[PDB]
Design a protein around this ligand. Structure first.
Ligand code: CLA
Ligand code: CLA
Ligand code: CLA
Ligand SMILES: C=Cc1c(C)c2cc3nc(c4c5[nH]c(cc6nc(cc1[nH]2)C(C)=C6CC)c(C)c5C(=O)[C@@H]4C(=O)OC)[C@@H](CCC(=O)OC/C=C(\C)CCC[C@H](C)CCC[C@H](C)CCCC(C)C)[C@@H]3C
Ligand SMILES: CCCCCCCCCCCCCCCCCC(=O)OC[C@H](CO[C@@H]1O[C@H](CO)[C@H](O)[C@H](O)[C@H]1O)OC(=O)CCCCCCCCCCCCCCCCC
Ligand SMILES: CCCCCCCCCCCCCCCCCC(=O)OC[C@H](CO[C@@H]1O[C@H](CO)[C@H](O)[C@H](O)[C@H]1O)OC(=O)CCCCCCCCCCCCCCCCC
Ligand SMILES: CCCCCCCCCCCCCCCC(=O)OC[C@H](COP(=O)(O)OC[C@@H](O)CO)OC(=O)CCCCCCCCCCCCCCC
Ligand SMILES: CCCCCCCCCCCCCCCC(=O)OC[C@H](COP(=O)(O)OC[C@@H](O)CO)OC(=O)CCCCCCCCCCCCCCC
Ligand SMILES: CCCCCCCCCCCCCCCC(=O)OC[C@H](COP(=O)(O)OC[C@@H](O)CO)OC(=O)CCCCCCCCCCCCCCC
Ligand SMILES: CC1=C(/C=C/C(C)=C/C=C/C(C)=C/C=C/C=C(C)/C=C/C=C(C)/C=C/C2=C(C)CCCC2(C)C)C(C)(C)CCC1
Ligand SMILES: CC1=C(/C=C/C(C)=C/C=C/C(C)=C/C=C/C=C(C)/C=C/C=C(C)/C=C/C2=C(C)CCCC2(C)C)C(C)(C)CCC1
Ligand SMILES: CC1=C(/C=C/C(C)=C/C=C/C(C)=C/C=C/C=C(C)/C=C/C=C(C)/C=C/C2=C(C)CCCC2(C)C)C(C)(C)CCC1
Lengths: 484, 30, 37, 187, 28, 36, 33, 348, 33, 76, 31
C-alpha cells in the first residue's frame, strides 16, 4: 500500500528496472529536445539577424544549438544572415531529428531493460543476492565522463576536429562559431575569456580520467564506507542531487552575469550592461572619435551600426520583464523595424540637454532633461500648474541625427515630450506591433528565463539534497523508532 | 468568458468542500 | 502648579503616581519570598 | 580629532535653529534642518537651500546685474513685484476650463498679494518686501506662501525668495521663513 | 582624439551609475 | 550556600534591569536622538 | 545635579525600597507570608 | 565499525569529547556553529552600537549616533562596491579595520558568518537527532528558514546591482526593505508571497487551534483545579481525548483530524511549504520577474478612462512610493527630481 | 605576489589555516586532557 | 556542573564578581567617554558629519580606491 | 572551574556588560 508519493520507490532495490526508468527519463528528455527544436524552427523568423535576432523571438534551444556550432538549416537560411549553400545533416532540423530518433531508441531499450529485469549481472557472485558495487560503478562512469570531457575540450571548441564555439566581439556586433585556442595562463580563469573553456575542459578532463583510475582501483576504507553510507543507492542520490544543484547555481549565476559561454548575440544583453552603460559609453566614444576626425554630428551618428544602438535599449534588458508576461520579446513590444536615430535635445539658449535614462528598477520613470553639469534644466511635469521646468517654458527642441529621422528637427512641445519620453528608454526605434498584436509591456530575454528556471530548480534540489540525504543517514529509524 | 471560468473554479472548490464535509470517510475508531 | 506652600514638595508628587504599578511588583516579590509556595 | 573625546556630561553648541551663511555680498541665516540644494530653476540663482522633510519649503538667493542705479528706480514696490511675474512658476496647461472654483476662466493658478512694504538697514539700505499666496486648482498643500526681499547695490539686484506650503506654514514653518527673511542683509 | 572629460560629462547626466563615472572617481 | 536567598538576588537584579531600562528611556528623551 | 532631581531620586529610592524592605523585615522576623 | 572497530584513532578521541552531553552540546557541528554564530551576533551588536552608515547610505544607524533599538541597523555597503565580498584584507578596505567598518564590510561579515551559522545549526540538528536516534524532521523543517535567508539575503542581492539592495540587519531597515518591495516589485500581488502568507497564517492558526483543543479536551487525571500538575512525563496514556476533539471539530467545523501523526505532520508541513513558496517568489523578484500588472486591465483602463479597480489604485500607490523614495533611498542614482515631476494627488 | 590583492589573499589563506589548526589543536588537547 | 541557584546564592561568587562587573561597566563608560569608540569604529562625532566643502551626505561612488575615497570623505 | 559552560556564560556576559556600560555612557551625550 504505497502512498502516491512513494510509488517510484518500487525500483529502489531492483537494478534492472532502475536502468529502465532512468532510460525512460533520458528518452523523454531527448524527445523534448527534438520537439522543442522542431517547434522553434517552425515559429522562427530568420530574415533579419539585426533588430530581430533569436533572443527577441523567445528561442530557447536555438541559442544553445548555435553556441555549440550548429548554424545552418535545411530551409536555406543561416543564423548569421548568409545563404545556406550546404547545411549538411547537422542543421537545426538534423539535430532535432537526431535527438528524436535517439529518444525512440531509448524508449525501446527502456522497454527491454524493464521486461528482463532479473539479470545475473546484478547478482552478488558470493552471496547470490542483488547488489551494486557503487564505488566501482562510480569509478567506471567517472572515467567515462572524464574521457568525454577531455575529448570535447581538445577536439571540439578547439576546432582540431570539431567546429569550435561561438566567439564574439566585446560589443556583440560580429560573432560567429570559431575555433578557440586554450588559455594556459592566469587569463584562462577570466570568465569572459573564451580560451578558458577549452583549456579547462582539457585539464579537468584529464584529471577526471586519473580520478576515475583511482575511484576504480582503490576500495574505500571501512570507516569511510560506513560513514558515507556507501552501498546504499540513496546516499548516491543525495550526493548527486547536491552536486547537480551546485551546478545549477553556477550556471544560473554565469548566465545572469554573462560570460564567454553565454554570448549576448544568442541570449541577449545582461542587465549589468544597461546599468553600467556598457553600450552607451561605446556609442558616445565612437561618436566623439568621429567628431574629432572633423565629421559632422549627422555623419558621426550615421556611422553607428544599428545593432549596437539596438543593444542600448531598455526593452532588451532581461530584468525589464514580468513573471506572467509570457512569450517572445516581440509579443510585448513590437517587432523592431528600424532605428529612428539619435535624439539631441537643446533648449532655446542652446545648452545641450540629456534625458535621464530609466534605471532597471523602475517600471515607470519621470522624464527629466539634465544639463551637462548635472543640473536639471527641463522635464515633463506632473503638475502643469505653476510649472518651473516645463518643455514649453524652457523651449526644448529635438534634432535627430542618423537613422530614419536624419537631420529632422521638431520644435512643437507635444512631439518633443513624446520623443523625450521615448528616449528615457535608451535608443529610439520604430516597432511594428500590428503583426503580433503586441500589448506594450516588456518581456524578458531568454537568459532571464533560463536564470529564473534554473535558480528555482537549484533551490528545490537543495531541499532534495536535504530530504534524500536525511533519509540516507537515518534509514534504520525511518521505518520507525523504538522509543529512546 | 473569463468570468465564466472563474465562476466555474469557485463552484468546483465549493462543491469539493461540500463533498468533503458531508461525504467524508467515517473516522474509524481503532 | 501647586500652591506656593507645597512647591518644595513637588518631587514627591512627581514620584507618587508610579506606586500603583509598584504594588503588583511587590506582590510578585512577596510570592518569590515564599518560593512561590 | 581622534583623541578629542566624547561629550559626556557636556553642553550643546547651539539650539537657536539658525546657522549663519556668508554670500558674495550678503549675509543670511538658514534653518538648521534645511539642506543645501543643487537645482537652479533660474540661471541667476546664486544660493539655494531646501527643507529636509518637505521640499516645497525652500529658499533661494538670486544675484543678477541691474541697469537701475537703486531699487527705487524700478518704481513702486507693487510695480517691481509685477515685473517679476515668472518667479511664481508658469501655467503650462492651456485648455479652456470653467469647472474650477475660485479661479477665473481658463486659469488653474492664482497669486494674491497679501502685502508689500519697504524696510531699512543699519546703513539706511532700502529693501522691498513682498508676501504672496499662490493657490492652484488642485490646491496643493492649500496654497504656497512666498516671501520676497529685494535690494539693489553696486549695480546688482539681490532677491531672496522663500517658499513654504500653507500646511507647513500653519504648524510652525512660519517662524523659520520669517527668520530667513529677516536675516537677509546685503552690503 | 577623444575628450575623456566631455565623455564622462555626457554619460553622467543620462546615467550617473555608468562605469565611466565610477572608474577612478577619487582622482576627480 | 543558603546565604543570600535567591529571591533577594532576583529582586535586586530585576531592580537594576528596570533602572537600566529607565535610564535608556530617559536618554531617548534627552541628548542625542531627542529630536532637539 | 538639580535640587529637584536630587529630591526626586531620594523619594524614588525611598518608595522603591519600601516594599522589599517590609518583605525582608517580615522574612527575618518570621511573620506569616 | 561494522565488521570490527579496528583501533581507536585520534578522531575517536575527538568524537568522544565533542559528543559528550554537557550543558551546551558542541558536537562536530559546533566547530562551525559556535564561532560563526557568535561572530554574526557580536558583529550585529557592535554595528548597531558603534558602526555608522554615513558613508554607505548617508544615514546614521548606530547607538553612538543617537539611534535606538528600532532605528539602528548594520547597513549594507555602497552600491558602487557591487557584489564585492568586502574582505577586511580585500582590495577595497586593504586592511584598514576602521575604514572597513566605514565602507560597510561589517554587513558582508555578518551575512556570511550568519549563513555558515545556519548551515552549522542544521548540522547540529542532524547530529543531535542521530545521537538520540530520531527521524530528523526538525532539520527538514529548518530547511525553510535557510531557504528564506538564502533567497532574501543572498540570491536577491546577487540578482540586483549589488549588496546595497539587500536587507540591512535592523528593524527599520527591514521595514524599508518591505516597503521597497511593495513599491517596486508589487510583492503583494505576487502569488508566491500569497502562498507564503497563507502558509504562515495557517501555521499560526494550527498552533493556536491545536493548543486550545488539547488544553480543552484534557482528561481529568487529578483533583486540583490546576490541570498542569495532573501529568507525568513517563505516562503512556494520552493526556487528552482524541475522540472528543474529533467529534467537537466535526460538528463545529465539518471536518476534523482523526490521526495524531497526520495532524502533527500537517502542523510541520504547512509553514515549511509556505516559506518555500515565498522563497521561490523572492528568487523570481531577484530576477525582476515580478507579477507587477494584469495587462488586460491596464489596456482596458488605457482605452476606458472610467474603469477603475483596487488593482489600479494599488498601481498608483506603487508609483507614488517609487517616485518619492527613489531620491533618498538610492543615493548613487543622484536623482535630483524637481517637485513638479513627482506624482501627487489633489491638495495633499 | 605580483598583485597586492594576491598577497593579501595568500596571507588570508595562511591566517585561516592558522585559526583552523588552532581549533583542531585545542580540541585535541582537551580530548586528551 | 554546580546548579545555578547554588552559585548565584553563594557569597563567594558575589564577592568575586562585585569588583569585576563594575570594572567592565566602568571600562565601557570610559571607552565611550574618552573618544576611543569614535577613534576605532570610525563613526563621526556630532561636529564632524559635514566638512568645509562637503555640506551634504557622502557617496562612496568607487569600487577600487574606495579606501582613499572614504579617507578623504571622512573627518580629517 | 573554567569549563565549557563557564566559557559559554562569559562569552555572552563580559561583552554584554561592556556594551551596557557603553550605551549608558552614550545616554548622557550632548550634541
Ligand atoms: C533526480 C532527483 C531525484 C530523484 C531521482 C528522486 C527520487 C525519489 N524521491 Mg525525491 N526529491 C527530489 C529529487 C529526486 N527524487 C527533489 C529535488 C525534491 C525536493 C522537491 C524531492 C523531494 C522528495 C520527497 C518529499 C519525497 C521524495 C521521494 C522520492 C522517492 C519516490 C519518488 C516518488 O515516487 O514520488 C512520486 C511522484 C509523483 C507521483 C508525481 C508528482 C508530480 C510532481 C508533483 C510534478 C510533476 C513534475 C513534472 C511532471 C516533471 C518536471 C520535473 C523536472 C523538470 C525536474 C524516489 C526514490 C519520496 C520518498 O522519500 O520515498 C519514500 C518522498 O517522500 N522526493
Ligand atoms: C527551465 C526550462 C525552460 C525555459 C527557461 C524556457 C523558456 C522559454 N520558453 Mg519554454 N518550454 C519548456 C521549458 C523552458 N522554457 C518545456 C519543458 C516545454 C515543453 C512543455 C516548453 C515549451 C515552450 C513553448 C511551446 C514555448 C516556450 C516558450 C519560451 C520562451 C517564452 C518565455 C516563457 O517561458 O513564458 C513564461 C513562462 C511562464 C509564465 C511559466 C511560469 C512558471 C509558473 C510559476 C509555474 C506555476 C504553475 C502553477 C503552480 C500551476 C497553476 C497554473 C494553472 C492555472 C495553469 C522562454 C525563453 C515560448 C516561445 O518563446 O516560443 C518560441 C513558446 O511558445 N516553451
Ligand atoms: C567556524 C570558523 C570560521 C569560518 C567558517 C569562517 C568563515 C569566513 N570568515 Mg572568519 N574568522 C574566524 C572563523 C571562521 N571564519 C575566527 C575564529 C576569526 C578571528 C580571527 C575570524 C575572523 C575573520 C575576519 C576578520 C574575516 C573573516 C572572514 C570570513 C569569510 C571569508 C572567508 C575567507 O576568505 O577566509 C579565508 C579562507 C580560507 C581559510 C580557506 C581555507 C584554507 C585552509 C584553511 C588552508 C589552506 C591554505 C594552505 C596554506 C594551502 C568566511 C565566510 C572575512 C569576512 O568576514 O568577509 C567579509 C573577514 O574579513 N573571518
Ligand atoms: C523572523 C523570524 C524568525 C526568527 C528570528 C527565528 C529564529 C530562530 N529559529 C530557530 C529555530 C527554528 N526555526 C524553525 C522554523 C521557522 N522559523 C521561522 C521564523 C523565525 N525563526 C519560521 C517562519 C519557521 C517556519 C518554517 C525551526 C524548525 C527551527 C529550529 O529547529 C530552531 C530552534 O531550535 O528553535 C527553537 C532558532 C535557532 C536559530 C539559531 O540559533 O541559529 C544559530 C545562530 C545563528 C545562525 C546566528 C544568526 C545569524 C543570522 C542568520 C544573521 C544575522 C542576524 C542578526 C544577528 C540579527 C539581526 C536582527 C535584525 C534583522 C532585527 C532561532 C531562535
Ligand atoms: C498546464 C499548466 C501550464 C503552466 C504554464 C502556463 C504558462 C502560460 C502560457 O500559456 O504561456 C506559455 C508560454 C508561451 O506563451 C505564449 O507565447 C507566445 C509567443 O511564443 C505569445 O507571446 C503568447 O501571447 C503567449 O501566451 O510558453 C511556455 O510554455 C512557458 C514555458 C514554461 C517554462 C518557463 C521557464 C521555466 C519556469 C519555471 C520552471 C520551474 C520552476 C520551479 C517552479 C516554479
Ligand atoms: C546577546 C545577549 C543579549 C542580546 C539581547 C538583545 C539585544 C538588544 C539590544 C537593544 C539595545 O541595546 O538598545 C539600546 C537602546 C539605546 O537607546 C538609545 O541610546 C542612544 C544613545 O545615543 C540615544 O540616546 C537614543 O535616543 C536612545 O533610545 O536602548 C533602547 O533602545 C531601549 C530599548 C532596548 C531594549 C528593548 C528591546 C529588547 C528586544 C528584545 C529583547 C528580547
Ligand atoms: C581581527 C583583526 C582584523 C585585522 C585587520 C586585518 O586583517 O588586516 C588585513 C591585513 C593587512 O595587511 P596589509 O595589506 O595592510 O599589509 C600590506 C600593506 O602594506 C599593503 O596593503 O591583511 C592581511 O594580512 C591578511 C588578513 C588576514 C587576517 C584577518 C583574519 C585572520 C583570521 C581569519 C581568517 C578568516 C576566517 C575564516 C577562517 C576559516
Ligand atoms: C492580557 C493578557 C493577560 C491575560 C491573557 C488571558 C489568557 C487566556 C488564555 C489563552 C489561551 C486560550 C485557551 C487555552 C487554555 O485553555 O489554556 C489552558 C489553561 C487551563 O489551566 P487550568 O484551568 O488548569 O488553570 C487553573 C485555573 O485556570 C482554574 O480554572 O489556561 C491557563 O493555563 C490559564 C493560565 C493563567 C494565565 C495568567 C495570565
Ligand atoms: C459551519 C461552517 C461550515 C464551513 C466550514 C468549511 C469546512 C472546510 C472543510 C474542507 C476541507 C477540505 C479538505 C478535505 C480533506 C479532509 O479534510 O479530510 C479530513 C481530514 C481528517 O482526516 P484524517 O485525520 O483521517 O487524516 C489521516 C489520513 O491521512 C488517513 O488516515 O481533516 C484534515 O485533513 C484537516 C482538516 C482540513 C483543514 C481545513 C481545510 C482548509 C481549506 C479551506 C479551503 C478554502 C476554499 C475557499 C473557497 C474558494
Ligand atoms: C518510439 C520509436 C520512434 C520515435 C517516435 C517519436 C516521434 C518519438 C518522439 C517523442 C516525443 C515528441 C517526446 C516529447 C516529450 C516531451 C516532454 C518529455 C516534455 C514535457 C514537459 C514538461 C515535463 C514541462 C513541465 C512544466 C510546464 C508544463 C509548466 C512550467 C513548468 C514545467 C516546465 C516544469 C522511432 C521512430 C525512432 C522508431 C523506434 C521507436
Ligand atoms: C503616598 C505617599 C507615601 C507612599 C506610600 C506607599 C504606598 C508606598 C509604596 C511602596 C511600595 C509598594 C513599594 C514596592 C516596590 C516593589 C518592588 C521594588 C518590586 C520589584 C520587583 C522586581 C524588580 C522583580 C521581581 C520578579 C518578578 C516580576 C517575577 C518573579 C521573580 C522576581 C521576584 C525577581 C510616602 C511614604 C512616600 C509619604 C508620602 C506620601
Ligand atoms: C565585529 C568584528 C569582531 C567580532 C566582535 C564580537 C563577537 C563582539 C561581541 C559583541 C557582543 C556579544 C555584544 C553584546 C551586546 C549585548 C547588549 C548590548 C545587551 C542588550 C540587553 C538589553 C538592551 C536589555 C533589555 C531588557 C531590559 C533593560 C529590561 C528587561 C527586559 C530586557 C532584558 C529585554 C571580530 C573580533 C571578528 C573582528 C572583526 C570585527
Amino acid at each position: 500500500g504505497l502512498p502516491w508519493y512513494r510509488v517510484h520507490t518500487v525500483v529502489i532495490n531492483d537494478p534492472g528496472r532502475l536502468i529502465s526508468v532512468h532510460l525512460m527519463h533520458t528518452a523523454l528528455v531527448a524527445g523534448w529536445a527534438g520537439a522543442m527544436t522542431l517547434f522553434e524552427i517552425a515559429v522562427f523568423d530568420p530574415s533579419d539577424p539585426v533588430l530581430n535576432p533569436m533572443w527577441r523571438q523567445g528561442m530557447f534551444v536555438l541559442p544553445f544549438l548555435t553556441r555549440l556550432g550548429v548554424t545552418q538549416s535545411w530551409g536555406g537560411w543561416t543564423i548569421s544572415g548568409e545563404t545556406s549553400s550546404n547545411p549538411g545533416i547537422w542543421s537545426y532540423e538534423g539535430a532535432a531529428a537526431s535527438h528524436i530518433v535517439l529518444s525512440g531508441l531509448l524508449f525501446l531499450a527502456s522497454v527491454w531493460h524493464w521486461v528482463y529485469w532479473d539479470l545475473e549481472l546484478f547478482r552478488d557472485p558470493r552471496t547470490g543476492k542483488t547488489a551494486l558495487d557503487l564505488p566501482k560503478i562510480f569509478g567506471i562512469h567517472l572515467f567515462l565522463a572524464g574521457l568525454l570531457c577531455f575529448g570535447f575540450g581538445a577536439f571540439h571548441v578547439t576546432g582540431v576536429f570539431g567546429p569550435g564555439i561561438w566567439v564574439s566581439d566585446p560589443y556583440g556586433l560580429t560573432g560567429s562559431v570559431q575555433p578557440v585556442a586554450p588559455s594556459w595562463g592566469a587569463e584562462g580563469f577570466d570568465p569572459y575569456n573564451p580560451g578558458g573553456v577549452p583549456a579547462h575542459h582539457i585539464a579537468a578532463g584529464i584529471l577526471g580520467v586519473l580520478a576515475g583510475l583511482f575511484h576504480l582501483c582503490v576500495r574505500p576504507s571501512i570507516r569511510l564506507y560506513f560513514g558515507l553510507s556507501m552501498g546504499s543507492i540513496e546516499s548516491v542520490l543525495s550526493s548527486s542531487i547536491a552536486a547537480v544543484f551546485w551546478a545549477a547555481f553556477v550556471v544560473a549565476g554565469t548566465m545572469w552575469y554573462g560570460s564567454a559561454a553565454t554570448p549576448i548575440e544568442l541570449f541577449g544583453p545582461t542587465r549589468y550592461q544597461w546599468d553600467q552603460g556598457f553600450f552607451q559609453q561605446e556609442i558616445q566614444k565612437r561618436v566623439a572619435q568621429s567628431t574629432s576626425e572633423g565629421l559632422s554630428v549627422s555623419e558621426a551618428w550615421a556611422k553607428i551600426p544599428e545593432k549596437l544602438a539596438f543593444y542600448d535599449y531598455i526593452g532588451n534588458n532581461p530584468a525589464k520583464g514580468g513573471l506572467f508576461r509570457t512569450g517572445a520579446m516581440n509579443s510585448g513590444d513590437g517587432i523592431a523595424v528600424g532605428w529612428l536615430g539619435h535624439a539631441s535635445f537643446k533648449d532655446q539658449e542652446g545648452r545641450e540637454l540629456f534625458v535621464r535614462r530609466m534605471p532597471t528598477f523602475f517600471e515607470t520613470f519621470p522624464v527629466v532633461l539634465i544639463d551637462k553639469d548635472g543640473v536639471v534644466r527641463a522635464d515633463v511635469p506632473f503638475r502643469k500648474a505653476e510649472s518651473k521646468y516645463s518643455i514649453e517654458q524652457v523651449g526644448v527642441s529635438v534634432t535627430f541625427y542618423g537613422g530614419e529621422l536624419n537631420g529632422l528637427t521638431f520644435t512643437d512641445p507635444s512631439t518633443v515630450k513624446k520623443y523625450a519620453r521615448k528616449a528615457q528608454l535608451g535608443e529610439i526605434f520604430e516597432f511594428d506591433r500590428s503583426t503580433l498584436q503586441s500589448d506594450g509591456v516588456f518581456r524578458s530575454s531568454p537568459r532571464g528565463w533560463f536564470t529564473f528556471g534554473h535558480l528555482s530548480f537549484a533551490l528545490l534540489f537543495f531541499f532534495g539534497h536535504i530530504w534524500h540525504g536525511s533519509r540516507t543517514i537515518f534509514r534504520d529509524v525511518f521505518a520507525g523508532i523504538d522509543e529512546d | 468568458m473569463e468570468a465564466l471560468v472563474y465562476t466555474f473554479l469557485l463552484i468546483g472548490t465549493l462543491g469539493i468542500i461540500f463533498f468533503s464535509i458531508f461525504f467524508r470517510e467515517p473516522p474509524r475508531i481503532a | 502648579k501647586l500652591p506656593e506652600a507645597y512647591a518644595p514638595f513637588s518631587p514627591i508628587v512627581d514620584v507618587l503616581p508610579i506606586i500603583p504599578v509598584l504594588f503588583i511588583l511587590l506582590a510578585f516579590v512577596w510570592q518569590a519570598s515564599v518560593s512561590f509556595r | 580629532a581622534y583623541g578629542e573625546g566624547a561629550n559626556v556630561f557636556g553642553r550643546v553648541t547651539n539650539k537657536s535653529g539658525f546657522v549663519p551663511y556668508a554670500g558674495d555680498s550678503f549675509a543670511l541665516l538658514l534653518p538648521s534642518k534645511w539642506n543645501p540644494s543643487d537645482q537652479k530653476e533660474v540661471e541667476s540663482i546664486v544660493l539655494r537651500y531646501e527643507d529636509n522633510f518637505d521640499a516645497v519649503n525652500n529658499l533661494y538667493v538670486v544675484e543678477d546685474k541691474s541697469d537701475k542705479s537703486s531699487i527705487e528706480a524700478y518704481g513702486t514696490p507693487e510695480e517691481f513685484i509685477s515685473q517679476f511675474g515668472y518667479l511664481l512658476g508658469k501655467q503650462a496647461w492651456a485648455g479652456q476650463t470653467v469647472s474650477e472654483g475660485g479661479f477665473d476662466a481658463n486659469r488653474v493658478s492664482n497669486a494674491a498679494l497679501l502685502g508689500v512694504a519697504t524696510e531699512k538697514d543699519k546703513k539706511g539700505k532700502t529693501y522691498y518686501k513682498f508676501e504672496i499666496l499662490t493657490r492652484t486648482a488642485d490646491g496643493n498643500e492649500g496654497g504656497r506662501h512666498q516671501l520676497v526681499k529685494a535690494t539693489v547695490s553696486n549695480g546688482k539686484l539681490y532677491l531672496l525668495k522663500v517658499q513654504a506650503g500653507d500646511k507647513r506654514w500653519f504648524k510652525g514653518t512660519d517662524k523659520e521663513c520669517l527668520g530667513v527673511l529677516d536675516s537677509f542683509t546685503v552690503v | 582624439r577623444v575628450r575623456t572629460v566631455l565623455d564622462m560629462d555626457r554619460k553622467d547626466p543620462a546615467k550617473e551609475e555608468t562605469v565611466k563615472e565610477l572608474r577612478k572617481d577619487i582622482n576627480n | 550556600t543558603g546565604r543570600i536567598p535567591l529571591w533577594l538576588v532576583g529582586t535586586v537584579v530585576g531592580l537594576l534591569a528596570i533602572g537600566l531600562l529607565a535610564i535608556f528611556f530617559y536618554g531617548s528623551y534627552v541628548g542625542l536622538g531627542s529630536s532637539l | 545635579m538639580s535640587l529637584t532631581l536630587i529630591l526626586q531620586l531620594v523619594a524614588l529610592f525611598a518608595v522603591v525600597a519600601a516594599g522589599p524592605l517590609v518583605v525582608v523585615l517580615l522574612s527575618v522576623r518570621g511573620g506569616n507570608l | 565499525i561494522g565488521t570490527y572497530q579496528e583501533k581507536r584513532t585520534w578522531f575517536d578521541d575527538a568524537d568522544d569529547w565533542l559528543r559528550q552531553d554537557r550543558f551546551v552540546f558542541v558536537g562536530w557541528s559546533g566547530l562551525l556553529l559556535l564561532p560563526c554564530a557568535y561572530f554574526a551576533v557580536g558583529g550585529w551588536l557592535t554595528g548597531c552600537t558603534f558602526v555608522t552608515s554615513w558613508y554607505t547610505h548617508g544615514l546614521a544607524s548606530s547607538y553612538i549616533e543617537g539611534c535606538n533599538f528600532l532605528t539602528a541597523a548594520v547597513s549594507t555597503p555602497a552600491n558602487s562596491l557591487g557584489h564585492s565580498l568586502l574582505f577586511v584584507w580585500g582590495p577595497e578596505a586593504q586592511g584598514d579595520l576602521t575604514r572597513w567598518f566605514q565602507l560597510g564590510g561589517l554587513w558582508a561579515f555578518v551575512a556570511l558568518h550568519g549563513a555558515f551559522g545556519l548551515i552549522g545549526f542544521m548540522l547540529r540538528q542532524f547530529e543531535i537527532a542521530r545521537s538520540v536516534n530520531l527521524r530528523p524532521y526538525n532539520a527538514i523543517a529548518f530547511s525553510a528558514p535557510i531557504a528564506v535567508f538564502v533567497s532574501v539575503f543572498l540570491i536577491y542581492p546577487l540578482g540586483q546591482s549589488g549588496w546595497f539592495f539587500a536587507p540591512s540587519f535592523g528593524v527599520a531597515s527591514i521595514f524599508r526593505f518591505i516597503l521597497f518591495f511593495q513599491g517596486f516589485h508589487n510583492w503583494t500581488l505576487n502569488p508566491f508571497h500569497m502562498m507564503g502568507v497563507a502558509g504562515v497564517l495557517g501555521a499560526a492558526l494550527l498552533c493556536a487551534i491545536h493548543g486550545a483543543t488539547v488544553e480543552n479536551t484534557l482528561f481529568e487525571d487529578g483533583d486540583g483545579a490546576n490541570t498542569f500538575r495532573a501529568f507525568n512525563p513517563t505516562q503512556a496514556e494520552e493526556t487528552y481525548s482524541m475522540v472528543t476533539a474529533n467529534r467537537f471539530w466535526s460538528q463545529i467545523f465539518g471536518v476534523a483530524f482523526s490521526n495524531k501523526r497526520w495532524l502533527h505532520f500537517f502542523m510541520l508541513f504547512v509553514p515549511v511549504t509556505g516559506l518555500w513558496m515565498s522563497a521561490l517568489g523572492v528568487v523570481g523578484l531577484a530576477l525582476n520577474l515580478r507579477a507587477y500588472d494584469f495587462v488586460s486591465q491596464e489596456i482596458r483602463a488605457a482605452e476606458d478612462p472610467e474603469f477603475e479597480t483596487f488593482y489600479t489604485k494599488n498601481i498608483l500607490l506603487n508609483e507614488g512610493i517609487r517616485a518619492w523614495m527613489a531620491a533618498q533611498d538610492q543615493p548613487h542614482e543622484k536623482l535630483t527630481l524637481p517637485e513638479e515631476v513627482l506624482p501627487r494627488g489633489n491638495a495633499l | 605576489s605580483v598583485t597586492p590583492s594576491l598577497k593579501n589573499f595568500l596571507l588570508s589563506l595562511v591566517a585561516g589555516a592558522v585559526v583552523l589548526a588552532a581549533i583542531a589543536g585545542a580540541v585535541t588537547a582537551v580530548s586528551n586532557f | 556542573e554546580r546548579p545555578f541557584s547554588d552559585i548565584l546564592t553563594s557569597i563567594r561568587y558575589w564577592v568575586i564578581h562585585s569588583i569585576t562587573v563594575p570594572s567592565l561597566f566602568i571600562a565601557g563608560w570610559l571607552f565611550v567617554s574618552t573618544g576611543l569608540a569614535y577613534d576605532v569604529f570610525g563613526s563621526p562625532r556630532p561636529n564632524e558629519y559635514f566638512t568645509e566643502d562637503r555640506q551634504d551626505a557622502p557617496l562612496i561612488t568607487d569600487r577600487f580606491n574606495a579606501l582613499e575615497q572614504v579617507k578623504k570623505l571622512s573627518a580629517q | 572551574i573554567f569549563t565549557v559552560r563557564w566559557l559559554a556564560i562569559h562569552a555572552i556576559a563580559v561583552p554584554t556588560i561592556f556594551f551596557l556600560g557603553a550605551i549608558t555612557a552614550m545616554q548622557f551625550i550632548q550634541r
